[PDB]
Amino acid sequence: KEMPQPKTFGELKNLPLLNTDKPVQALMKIADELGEIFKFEAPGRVTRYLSSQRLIKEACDESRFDKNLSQAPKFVRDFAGDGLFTSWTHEKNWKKAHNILLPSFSQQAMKGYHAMMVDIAVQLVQKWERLNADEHIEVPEDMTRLTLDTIGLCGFNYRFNSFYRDQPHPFITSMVRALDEAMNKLRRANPDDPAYDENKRQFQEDIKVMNDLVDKIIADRKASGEQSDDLLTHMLNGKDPETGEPLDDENIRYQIITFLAAGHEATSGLLSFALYFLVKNPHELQKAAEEAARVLVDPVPSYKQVKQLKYVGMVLNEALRLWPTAPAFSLYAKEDTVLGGEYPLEKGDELMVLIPQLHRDKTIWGDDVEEFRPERFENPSAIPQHAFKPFGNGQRACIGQQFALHEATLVLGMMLKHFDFEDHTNYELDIKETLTLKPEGFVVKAKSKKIPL
Ligand code: HEM
Ligand SMILES: NCCc1ccc(O)c(O)c1
């Protein structure tokens, strides 16, 4: 069969379609019009966007397709190096770092990070406890302060002290500006136009800022010899069972930058969309709050208590279903293959999985796919393979998944234990797109339940 393709702009092909502030949302609209697969061409390149579980399940066959670095992660690679997110499967440092780090990221490994997660969560709750009557909460802003500080404490025992600041630590400022330069580069018509000599200079400065801090901490740690409960300690002690090698210090620095750059925002966006859905759905808020009150019976939550927050984890999954915050991933065909019995592909041909549209497949979820209903996840095993994929696929799935979910369930539990919430502005959802998705401008008021920490 011949594939549909959205509107063209002469020699620019479909490229101007992505020249917008909200390209993923634009691509979802196109998928609504064109269906489970469409061709997307730009000068010099072609990809095919997949939206159905029928075709996505084939794309997720790792014997047939492997991760592709699309343009964004290619630009992110300029500062994240050959860290796990920006490396090809066939690079020696991807398999080395995968094998060393998968055990430091498992559900069991979360017991080790739990106390430093509670440290930063307690700072968030004390913040909101200390608001005056007339004040409000800037949700994504505070959620980013929490996840950056949590990843810096668990990753390398470094305190950004985001809740002590209006201007973030210089490393955060450089990192955020670096991710922005990377994303902006996707829409830049003439990247060598002297209008960007300042943007290129700033990018190199930002690379230098991030490198210097992270190298300095690594060095500081190797010298002291201090063992901590962070990922840096595991990375200095770890050896790949396959090669027998450890990660070198350059690659360790790249992984620390990666954890921060690639993990903080998808996680803070998750928390912010989950609070959005709960304030707009007071029956589900109340159910999640009754579970938090029933389960979090101690002044600070334990690892075991967080695991008992079943309905909070359903709310988190349902927010990921409607707005998966890391919204697409790219693949390439390892060999010639026919996709879906209908679409012949050649070795090297690219696919994109458009996650929000997968998660609207009515053949899997039913007709009410736009509705927020946590109870879809009462028994997650009922969901078919490759139907719910907010964390990617296979060996190249998110290595942060259990970290993100521990963090988000711990924090949303404490928030629901400690405050009632009001959508005092009747906020209208506005989804900003960076590397990730979040509800821009989402604000709420909290009223303390006056329960001790
Ligand atoms: C709700 C939060 C998050 C979501 C939705 C998310 C989603 C994803 C997805 C979709 C990918 C696959 C990307 C691809 O195929 O190109 C991935 C990879 C990755 N994520 Fe996450 N992530 C989240 C949180 C995090 C956290 C907290 C960390 C680290 C502390 C993290 C670190 C990584 C890394 C290193 C990879 C690359 C893994 C590999 O390819 O070996 N992520 N993530
Ligand atoms: N750890 C998430 C990093 C990330 C960000 C955006 C995406 O589209 C993606 O596939 C992965």
UniProtKB/Swiss-Prot annotation:
**Residues at the site labelled Important for catalytic activity:** 266
Tell me what effect the entry lists for residue 80 to I: No effect in binding affinity for laurate as substrate. High coupling of NADPH consumption to laurate formation. No indole hydroxylation. Favors omega-2 hydroxylation
Where are the residues of the annotated region Cytochrome P450?
1-453
What triggers production of this protein? Answer: By pentobarbital. Expression is negatively regulated by repressor bm3R1 at the transcriptional level.
Q: Which residues bind (9Z)-hexadecenoate?
A: 49
- Which residues bind heme per the record? 398
Role this protein plays? Functions as a fatty acid monooxygenase. Catalyzes hydroxylation of fatty acids at omega-1, omega-2 and omega-3 positions. Shows activity toward medium and long-chain fatty acids, with optimum chain lengths of 12, 14 and 16 carbons (lauric, myristic, and palmitic acids). Able to metabolize some of these primary metabolites to secondary and tertiary products. Marginal activity towards short chain lengths of 8-10 carbons. Hydroxylates highly branched fatty acids, which play an essential role in membrane fluidity regulation.
Under what name is this protein listed? Bifunctional cytochrome P450/NADPH--P450 reductase
- Naturally occurring in which organism (per UniProt): Priestia megaterium (strain ATCC 14581 / DSM 32 / CCUG 1817 / JCM 2506 / NBRC 15308 / NCIMB 9376 / NCTC 10342 / NRRL B-14308 / VKM B-512 / Ford 19) (Bacillus megaterium)
**Gene (UniProt):** cyp102A1
From-to range in the entire protein, with total length: 4 to 456 of 1049
